[PDB]
Every structure is written in structure tokens, then in C-alpha cells.
Point group: D2
């Protein structure tokens, strides 16, 4: 069973019929301008080929998908012992997939200023995605940063309990820019493929991250990667995936494929409605479930 | 490999001194922290085993997985997940499990218990399985927090059962006892998506086996499921009697009992063993 | 306090009955009349004035928590009571259901009937009426339906705050809450509190002063379930309510008041009863 | 109330100082002397008696009563209790907890921060009968630098659309309110205005409405001593409000205003020396309203 492009196109057309029932994120003004009728998917396989369908030219922000990359970069630089003293393993320290825990992970990114810390993250993202031209959306970063009262509430909370000791406005500058990193579904799928090959570049078999770090990321993508519905996603789809409210889903099917999906129309629970239907269809038809 | 497994058990037994048996249920405080048994059941319908394999141990929370399977079979996915949640009230925590137990069909405790035993007997391929009366009684005599939870569920209209009848069933359900060999065969049915490894009969639908294995990854290991996924990486379910039921999809059922628990309520000795086995045979599903 | 002025106040407050509703969650309580309202005011010269439906006997419900706390404070002492429950608006205070259950479990005696008799003896002395007993029908209705209270009891047992048979505790607790009397008897209890524990007829001490003060403090910080702050602003006196529609009030050095008005507001206190007390407080300047 | 007795009550209460500890989480308050204790008692004949260390102290949480009364006058009761709770236990529970207190301070009227502060200061000067009252710049600054929890509350309140102000601007006003400082004599004078239902003891004119004075005293019984208001009611029995600088403001209805400062706090963050002194005084003069 290889992934037939024409087959992908058909799944995309079916899933797009759900766009009417979803709604784009509108609490961040710049995301409210997204098209709920867009849907794109890429699947990257270990032969280092990719198949894709739908609106694949559209660059979309990672949003909470970036929490998985920042976790992986922190784990590399600091090691598992230190990271898991600051954040938790459980869906006691804060989970790194929830906003409060992600901010602690972001405050741990190495570098002497916002731009150097961001550059360390962008360089890492560019390597995983096999695309040196990846950057962030300045409009979306600015729209997040003007409007982010609850993330500021959590930064101050974290400061008060002495979990972090950074300047909140500088931590928020880094975090909103991390969330505003943008790419196509093709780039996102390749990041998933690296995770699926336990950290190895699919082109050069270079370890982009340690096997232990790839594994750690995948565990969190099963136990708590889909917002407040990971348990339902495990039952109905059954692959490691991380979602964000711009409509992205990054998935890593161990040893098999990276998948990247962008469908801006979200369900009532903040996950891509069009994207999850597409992945439900794909998982069933290709027997992707790890369970 | 049979001889290797004996060696792994010996190695994992060294950790017994660092754990302690559950003592909050008096019958369970009588367990020997030095015992450890394991069986591994493969799809060829063969089993290998090591350690204290004749010792029958109670399921405790492992029984929560079986009861969920049974109620999913009898009521369907739709009605079940209108009563309990899918998210790590969840059917693996005591409050959700008591709801699942209250859904078991039958006109009396006896009939409802027999439905669950008949189902366990089929999964285990052993018609001789029953429960420990001593353990059931020790549980029933002092289960204040579970009785608190039953009244909580009544108060809020989540169940309308008599609390004493529900507690009779629940304690008996938790007291179902078997050896590590029977427990691995149950893991094997799950690993094979509901299929009987001898006859290929579906003992449960594929969707039900999948659903069970998902809870076993997200919240099967008490309060340390995320750490177990990192350190071992297989669908497993534990209980405070020291059992760990694991189902490695398409590969083997594993049954461990090691009464010496860690500070987080999971078999310390049996953990260490599954960490060795998982490394040695590349069991992680991640 | 003029009788006929009291009658006019009661008829004004009865206009509110339509906006309230009786408690039906204890089934026998749903049988009460939302239109009834009775008040008695008892004064230090040992006289009482009343108005409205003064012959109806009504259960204390949560008002009985104050009586039980007084008894237990006398019998066990302050130090032991506040080692087991707190003093703040281990149970927070003796007014919330979890602390009340702990207080009730501290009543001494070998039997439920003996523990209860000690409660009734005390209430009969407070009220100056020896015929006070409990409503068997209301006690049963509560006992058959009291799921949350049993949940609390098993939680208290788990954490070794109580070690009593839960059915025995709940038999005692439901009977305590089902103790019934007229507004006149209730007002007399209020006056005993207002006079710092002294009997108004014979002037001898039915409870120590320190015990009367303690009850009156909980009657300000947490005596109207969910609305003690609002009540302090709109009425301004120590009072305790229950879901049968009772309000017991004790205006320090001035009067005791008992009101029964079964039509409750959304917060579970007598709607007709609080409106009546708001008018009374304004007229007689009762606020502490 | 005789003066020499007061002096002996102060000497008695001071022996507890060794069992208390000054608030050192606002570093500036860490500099206070745990052996200080002062008390003033103001009576409706407009006379005052005092003992111990008459010396200026920041009001801290005591200012929340003063802010509540100012906003109640300015916006009315049914805007105020639209926004904040009235109850001991996203709308904040009451105006005495930090979150409700920030909503209160956000409702103070004025264009500038300094305009808002000037209205509050003018009000406090009227109440205390002392136009020399200002705030401690050192304490305001030490607060403003380390106030992480209150900023976290401000952002949560903004997210849920309870407040609108810029957080730094609200924080500037709030920390300066909390840094208003005065002696126990000024404080007792405030407590007497409350006790006389809002009347000035000298002139007899209303400084605040009776309804506002009564609302203030109710929160001072139900939740004025932070986490020990029920204990305080049993052991002392009067409307009081405390703050972490060691202050206690009390108003005994119809009878006296009391102001205490004792920087050595018990483990609930109320003045340890202050509360012992007030227990002795309540017993001696039968002050309890219960």
C-alpha cells in the first residue's frame, strides 16, 4: 500500500465537505482571516518521497505544534534529567504540552537574547523540515502578542512560584514568534517523518535528534497532543499527532510516515475539524493505528 | 528465550527491597514482596514463563479493563462514552470504573459477577478462574473511599444502584485472581485485536480491543502512565496487588505479578523487568 | 414591638411567596405551604409577640447545627471541638455539612436513641417547651435520600476524622435536622443566645457565655448558606437558616427571633422570611 | 480607657514579638522592627489615648476598605456589586481578596494614575483628619518590582473582560494605594469615622454615607483578618481589617476607633503582637459585638 496521490485528492474533497460545520480561530485576529475551506495534506515516506493534495502552497503557522519542536530542542541542549525536573511527564510539574508547561520549556531555550533564542529554534526547524527558508509570520506574531492576556497571566504565575525568572515581555516575544513559525504541509510532513525515523534525516540518515528525544516527543503526541481530546483521537485515529489552533496537525507514524495537515476550520474543541476527518479516513484505509 | 527470562527475573528481584506491598487492604499486606512472575504469550499460541508462576494474584485495577470491554460489547461504544469519558469520568479511575461496573447486565450481584467471570474465563482460556473470597471480604469491610464515590455518583444521578450491591460486585470484580500465565493469555487476545489464539474466534470485536489498548497507553499505569510510555513504551495496565497486564499489538501478551510496589503504586520489581524486556526485544510502539 | 405592626409586616412579606419555592429535594419538605409565614420576637423581659401562622410546627434542618454545636462544646470542650473542625468561613467549620457531621458524631451516649435524647433534652430546655420532638416523616424522607451526606461520612471515615458506623451517624443526623417546633419556641432559643446563654424566665445559665458567643459568630460569618455577606448588609444580625424555611436570629442583648417561611429563594434561604427580617431590621434598627 | 493601663497592655503584648516574623516578601517591609507596637483608641468625644511606638506604617490590605468606600460613594452600590462579590465564600468573590481589590481600585475615577491617587489620598486625609498623609515611595517601589501574583490576577481579569485598564497603570495605582502610611493615631481616627457610621467626630458632617460605613464594617467581620476572621470574631469580636505591615484597623460600632501597628506577624499574616493586644483590650472593655 503506497499512498496514491489521486487517492489523497479524493480524501481531501470528502473532508472539505465538513468545513461548513467548523470555524476558524477568532481569538487571535490574524488567524480569523484564514479560509475555513482550505485543506492540505502531505505524506512523507522513508524512501524520502512525498505525496500531497489540496491547498499545499499555503503557509500556515505552527501554533501549539511548535511546543513539540521546542521540547525536542530543549531536551537536546539540557538533557532529559534537567527537563523533567522543570516540567512533567504526565497528561507536580506542568505538562510541556499545556500552555503553562510550554512557556517553561520556551524559557529554557538557550541564547542571550530573544533573537538568538529564536534563531536557535529556527535553525533547528529548518533542519527537521529540510527547508532553509522557513521563517515566522510577523503579522500573526504581532496579533498574538497584542492580545495574549492569559499567557501573560501564566508567565507572572510562573514567576511568582519561582519556576522561571525571565522578563515576561521578552518570554512572550519569544513564545509568540515560536507559535508564528509558518510552513506548508509538505514541510510539516517531513518533520513528522524525522520523528517517525527516530530522529534520523530521511535524506542523509544523520541523527537530527537523539532516538530517546524522538521517542519522548512521540509519547506526548499520543498522551496529550490533541488539545483536550487526545483520548478520543487515539480511539478514532490512533497515531501520534500534535494539533494547533491555526488548523495544523503534525503526525509521526512510527517507522512508516510523517503526515502534515492544515485545515483552518476547527471543531468545538479547537482541533482542525476538516483535518481530523481526513486523518480518520486515512487511518482506517491505510491501517495507520499503532494500537 | 526461557533461560534468559529466568535471568531477567533474578535481576529484577534485586529491587524488591526498595518496594513495599499494598497494606491498605489487609489481605494484600500479606503478600511476599520478594515474589515475581512473568509469562509471555506469543501468536503461535505458545507461552514462556519464569519466577513464582504458581502464585494466583488478584487483578485489582487490571479488572477495570475487562469490565470496560464487557460493557462495550454489551452496550456499544455509543452508550458507554455517554456515561464515562475518553480522556486521561474516565473508566480507569475509581469513580469511572464504578460507573462501568454498575453497567454490567444481570439481575443480581451473582448474575452480574458471572457475566464478568465467564468473559474472563474465555479471554484467559481457563474455565477454572474465580475470585479470592478472602481478598473480596477484606476489601468490602474497609472500602470507605469507594463507598464515598458510590454515594457521590448516586447523589448526582450518574448511577441508580444500591451502593452495597454495587460494592459487592466491584470488590468481587477486583478480587478475580489468576496466575501470570492466564494474565498473559488475556494480553495476547488484546494484542491480536480480540482474536482467540487457538481457534481464531473473535472473543471481542476489533474496535473493543483497540479501545482497551488506548486506555492502557494513556492512563493504565496508575499516575505514571506518561513515564511508563517513555521508559517501556507498551500498552499496560497495573494494579496494587502487583499485577501488570501488557498487550504488545500484533506481538505478545505479557502478564507480570510482583507485589512490591514503588511509591507511585505500580510493581517496582515488575516495571524493572518490563524495562529490561522492552529494551532487549524492542517492544516500544513509539 | 407592636403586635398589629407585626401582622402588617407579615402580610407585606407574604407578597413575595409566589417568587419562591419550597424545597422538594427532601420529598416530605415539598409538602409544605409556600404561602405560610410566622414570626415570633422574644424580649429580655421574657415576653413574646408573634404573627402569621404561629401554630405550624416546622423542622429546624440546618438550624439544628447550631444547637448540636452548643451541646458538643459544653460536653467535649472548645479545645477538642476545634481540633476536629475549623473556625473559618479537616472540615472548615461546624456550619458546612462535613463539619456538622463531625459535630453530630461527637454527641455522647451508647445508642442513637440516647445521643438523640441528650440533644432533645437540651433543645427542650433552650426552648422552654418540654414537648419538643422530631418529625418522623421528615427524618425518614431525609434518611432515604441523603446521598451527599453519606458520601461525606465515608470520606471522613477514610481520613480518620470520624470512626462511627455511617448508618448510625445518619440516623442521628436526620433526626436532629427533623426536630420541629413553632416560631415561638425558636424565638426563645434565639433569646437564650442573645442573653449570652441565660434562661429568660429564671435567669440561670442554659449554656456558658463563651458557647453562646461562639454560635453567634458562626451565625454572622456563615449562617445563611451562600449569602451570609448579603444578609449582614441587608439585615445585619446573627441568624441561621434552614431549607424548611426557618430563620433563627439572636440580636445580642436585645431579642430572639424565629421565622418560618417555607418559600425559599434561589440561594436556599426563606425568601418571605428574609424580606420580613429586612423590614424588621430597618424599623427597629437591629443591625449590629 | 486610661492611658497607663494601655502602656501595660502594650508591654504585655510585646513579649510575643519573639514568636512573630516581619513580612519579608516585599523586601522593604523586611526592614521593619518586630519589637514595635503602637495603639491608639479614638472615642466619640473626639479624644484619643495612645501607647507604644507612635511611628508611620503602610496600610497594605487596610487600604482595600478605604478604596471600597471611595468607589461605593463614586460609582454606587449596584455597579460595585455588579463587578465584585459580597461573599465570604470569573467574578471576584468580594472586595477584600486581592482579585476583588484590584477590580475595586480599577474603578477609581480620574484621567491620570496620579489623579486617581490624589482622589484616594484626599479621601484618606479627610477620614483620618490629617492632611499630611502621603505614601511611602520606597514601599510602593519594592511592591511594584516584586508583585507577580497581582499582575497574574490583572491579566486573568483582563482576559475575562472584568477590567480594561493597562496592567502596569493599574499596578502603579494599586501599589501606591497600599503604600499610604500613617501612625496608629490617624488610623484609629479612620476607625472612629466607621464606628460613628461615617460621621466626622469633630465636625459631625458625613464623610461617607451610613450605608457605605455599614458595608465596610460587614466585610471587616466576615473577611477582614484574611484567613483568620472566624478566630478573630471568637477571641476579639469586633470589625477589624489587617495588613502584612502589621496594621489592624478596628471600628467598634457606636464606641471607638482603634488603630494598631505591630510588624511581627503570626503565620496567617496578621499582627501577632497586635492581635494579643486586642484580645486583652476586648476582654477588659467588653468590646465584642456578639
Amino acid at each position: 500500500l503506497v499512498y496514491n496521490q489521486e487517492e489523497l485528492v479524493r480524501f481531501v474533497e470528502e473532508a472539505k465537505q465538513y468545513a461548513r460545520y467548523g470555524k476558524v480561530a477568532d481569538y487571535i485576529p490574524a488567524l480569523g482571516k484564514a479560509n475555513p475551506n482550505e485543506l492540505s495534506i502531505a505524506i512523507y515516506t522513508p524512501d524520502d518521497e512525498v505525496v500531497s493534495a489540496g491547498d499545499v502552497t499555503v503557509k500556515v503557522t505552527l501554533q501549539s505544534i511548535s511546543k513539540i519542536i521546542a521540547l525536542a530542542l530543549v531536551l537536546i541542549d539540557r538533557g532529559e534529567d534537567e527537563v523533567f525536573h522543570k516540567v512533567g511527564m504526565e497528561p507536580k510539574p506542568l505538562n510541556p504540552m499545556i500552555n503553562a508547561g510550554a512557556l517553561v520549556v520556551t524559557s529554557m531555550i538557550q541564547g542571550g537574547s530573544v533573537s538568538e533564542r529564536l534563531e536557535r529554534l529556527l535553525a533547528f526547524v529548518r533542519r527537521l523540515a529540510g527547508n532553509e527558508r522557513i521563517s515566522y509570520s510577523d503579522e500573526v506574531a504581532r496579533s498574538e502578542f497584542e492580545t495574549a492576556f492569559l499567557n501573560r497571566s501564566l508567565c507572572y504565575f510562573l514567576k511568582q512560584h519561582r519556576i522561571i525568572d525571565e522578563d515576561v515581555e521578552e518570554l512572550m516575544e519569544l513564545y509568540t514568534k515560536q507559535c508564528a513559525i509558518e510552513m506548508t504541509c509538505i514541510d510539516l510532513a517531513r518533520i513528522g517523518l524525522v520523528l517517525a525515523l527516530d530522529g534520523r534525516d530521511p535524506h542523509s540518515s544523520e541523527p537530527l535528534m537523539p532516538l530517546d528525544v524522538a521517542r519522548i516527543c512521540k509519547t506526548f503526541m499520543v498522551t496529550c497532543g490533541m488539545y483536550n481530546s487526545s483520548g478520543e483521537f487515539a480511539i478514532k485515529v490512533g497515531i501520534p499527532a500534535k494539533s494547533g489552533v491555526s488548523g495544523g496537525i503534525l503526525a509521526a507514524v512510527p517507522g512508516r510516515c510523517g503526515i502534515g495537515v492544515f485545515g483552518p476550520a476547527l471543531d468545538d474543541k479547537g482541533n482542525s475539524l476538516t483535518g481530523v476527518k481526513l486523518l480518520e479516513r486515512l487511518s482506517k484505509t491505510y491501517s495507520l493505528s499503532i494500537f
